[PDB]
Ligand SMILES: Nc1ncnc2c1ncn2[C@@H]1O[C@H](COP(=O)(O)OP(=O)(O)OP(=O)(O)O)[C@@H](O)[C@H]1O
């Protein structure tokens with residue numbers, strides 16, 4: 001009853017030029033009941049840094065040991081991305097993760113200028129051509145943001161929720177506002193978010209509510225659940241940092257170590273519904289993904305939407 | 310500092326004053342001290358906007374006598390101070406009317422923005438973070454097509470005006486010079502200069518390839534410099550989150566520049582030198598005009614009133630969503646009805662309609678299938 005293998009760093013599932021890499025079956029098993037986690041977001045929100053702290057890393061570790069490489073100051077000072085495609089990784093608990101290429105990334109577009117309507121329209125297709133994949137082969141999707149209320153993102157998801165190939169499978173969704181500040185934790189503002197997210201996605205058909213209640217996870221101690229009309233699945237993550245004089249400052253929010261330990265749980269404890277109509281294993285999932293990918297590029301809804309631009 | 314609609318109604322003490330204008334717009338996060346109001350109070354050196362004091366798009370102004378310059382702050386749904394009013398109101402009082410609501414507001418700012426480009430010399434947009442939203446490459450590319458359509462209509466509304474000649478031909482004082490403001494957001498915290506010069510290298514390449522920054526400084530709706538700053542990055546500051554400031558002090562009691570970045574551009578308009586931004590293989594002449602307060606409102610007032618604008622507005626990213634939604638639903642109507650007691654059989658075909666295709670207007674197009682079946686038998 002020896003173990004299968006052990007992963008120390010991510011691999012690549014999709015090439016940087018939209019090409020499937022079959023260098024992952026050597027790490028999968030033939031068992032069932034697997035979880036998958038996808039990610040969507042802008043350029044520098046902190047999506048590659050979150051999937052790592054949830055997969056196998058911890059905050060005490062250094063940024064150089066993350067399974068999913070993060071951004072270095074060499075590029076932040078000049079603008080740039082570091083993901084370049086879609087990654088892959090598995091944990092001891094047999095949970096799959098999938099970091100992704102940024103959504104509406106100028107650095108990607110800037111690189112295309114130095115290398116078929118226009119490069120702007122092509123990039124507008126890649127994201128939907130990616131987001132439609134995750135919405136077809138994943139159980140959870142973590143939508144990361146650096147600030148709050150970017151309508152250009154909420155109006156993008158529906159476009160993807162109406163482009164996939166095929167009662168119907170609508171996966172879960174999570175809204176994680178990274179780089180949060182003290183004001184983002186006051187309850188008077190907390191209810192404003194849930195009110196805005198629900199009205200902007202009331203007809204999204206995605207499962208964005210009735211799960212992952214940060215209100216009951218001991219974040220806000222004295223708040224009753226009747227304070228929010230509709231508690232959507234939203235979470236917050238902050239910015240990493242004789243006796244009287246040695247007191248710390250009023251940060252006004254829980255420590256980054258605590259919150260991450262809570263999200264690692266709630267996400268790991270999510271549901272695991274059946275994607276297809278066949279109880280599939282970890283290996284058949286891979287083959288299924290290749291089937292979707294080959295059906296997303298040479299599709300009809302995408303090409304039709306491309307010409308409208 | 311009052312709304313523009315309440316200002317254009319009339320001046321005597323500063324009717325003759327050579328001035329400039331500044332258009333402010335863009336996105337803003339959800340906070341008390343917006344990134345637009347604090348921009349004015351920081352430049353003017355005073356507390357202009359006091360802290361803690363059917364349509365969702367408006368614009369207000371302010372006149373700085375100590376500097377001879379006017380400001381205009383577009384406040385559309387893109388911001389959160391107004392987006393909340395919509396969601397809140399929309400919570401009290403479907404999938405179809407909603408599309409018309411969010412789309413109407415998406416149009417209301419488009420034309421409101423146009424009005425800013427035709428009466429401004431300088432204008433700076435904001436973004437709460439670096440990595441400028443690429444979506445602007447389409448907004449500005451589509452808006453241009455809208456201007457060319459209404460241009461023959463706006464010149465008539467300013468025909469009998471004392472603006473000038475060049476003004477009456479293009480409806481603008483001069484091809485504006487767009488700027489960019491980006492909050493740091495806790496990033497790096499020289500390093501900034503390396504970032505500023507990088508974004509400029511991006512924006513130029515991004516827009517230039519879109520053919521929105523052509524060689525001619527007349528066809529383009531907004532110019533960009535060649536040997537100047539062109540961008541600024543607001544670093545972090547303890548000013549925001551005011552309650553956290555006292556707590557930082559309470560613990561102690563118990564135990565370039567922004568103006569210089571905007572003044573280097575305003576020094577060229579007040580000095581009548583103008584903006585000469587045309588280096589696309591051959592220079593060209595760009596008109597210019599330095600108006601007065603009483604001379605500027607004459608056009609803006611007649612231009613603020615302008616059915617005519619609706620002709621090209623309704624015709625010229627919610628529109629693209631209705632197209633794919635109408636076609637995907639229409640295309641599924643034949644494969645569904647043609648492939649088809651009757652309540653069980655007719656409902657069976659309806660099950661295929663869900664998997665065939667849907668859209669933002671698929672609930673309405675399904676009536677054609679139901680009525681087409683109810684009429685059969
Ligand atoms: N809550 C946070 N507190 C402090 N630093 C953060 C936080 N979230 C993210 N960061 C930092 O922001 C940077 C973002 O790099 P990251 O690897 O997350 O990029 P990314 O989201 O994958 O972007 P891209 O897709 O463009 O490569 C890193 O330096 C990371 O440490």
Ligand SMILES: [Mg+2]
Pocket residue numbers: 047048069070082083084099100
């Ligand atoms: Mg990354």
